Amino acid sequence: MKRFNVSYVEVIKNGETISSCFQPFQKNENYGTITSANEQITPVIFHNLIMDMVLPKVVPIKGNKVTKMSMNLIDGFDCFYSTDDHDPKTVYVCFTLVDIPKILPIRILSGLQEYESNATNELLSSHVGQILDSFHEELVEYRNQTLNS
């Protein structure tokens, strides 16, 4: 099937990871990418990627929300960064799969903002998945706002 899955969701508070959603899967039924040549990297690689690339080039969003570094931090996954809706010292960096378009990670971070919890290396991951399922529902709902049929 054609589903989604944020490979690694590393949150950041004051330039320091607060939460993290780093869990392997080996492309189960979401998106073909990780399975062997993308399950060795440690959250630190991404945590340092972000911190060393994203953080030193992050922004509190002015009218984008969940923007990809477009710097090619690493190969195999897609890396974007979304700062808190009211706390620049509370970023939200996601590490989806290159196969994954540029819309899930957007709903993931913006989604975590839908809740009130996302400050643990096993909490944000929650809404990430709970937002993942509801994500598509939005993609479907999105196909009926101003269309003919």
Q: Which domains does the chain have, with CATH numbers?
A: 1-149 (3.30.450.230)
By the 8 A CB rule, do 17 and 24 touch?
Answer: no
Token duo for residue 133:
């399922």
28, 37, 47, 61, 65 from 12: Cα distances, Å: 28, 26, 9, 15, 15
Q: What is the sign of the dihedral through the CA atoms of 87, 131, 119 and 12?
A: negative
Q: What is the DSSP letter of 50?
A: I
User: Which residue in this structure is represented by tokens 């399922």?
Assistant: 133
d(CA 95, CA 45): 11
Backbone angles phi, psi at 9, to 5 degrees: -110, 95
Helical pair 124-141 and 104-112, crossing angle rounded to 10 deg:
130
Nearest Cα neighbor of 11 from 1, 21, 3 is 21
- Those residues with Cβ within 8 angstroms of residue 33's Cβ, 6 or more apart along the chain or in another chain: 7, 27, 76, 77, 97, 98, 99, 100
Q: How was this structure determined?
A: NMR
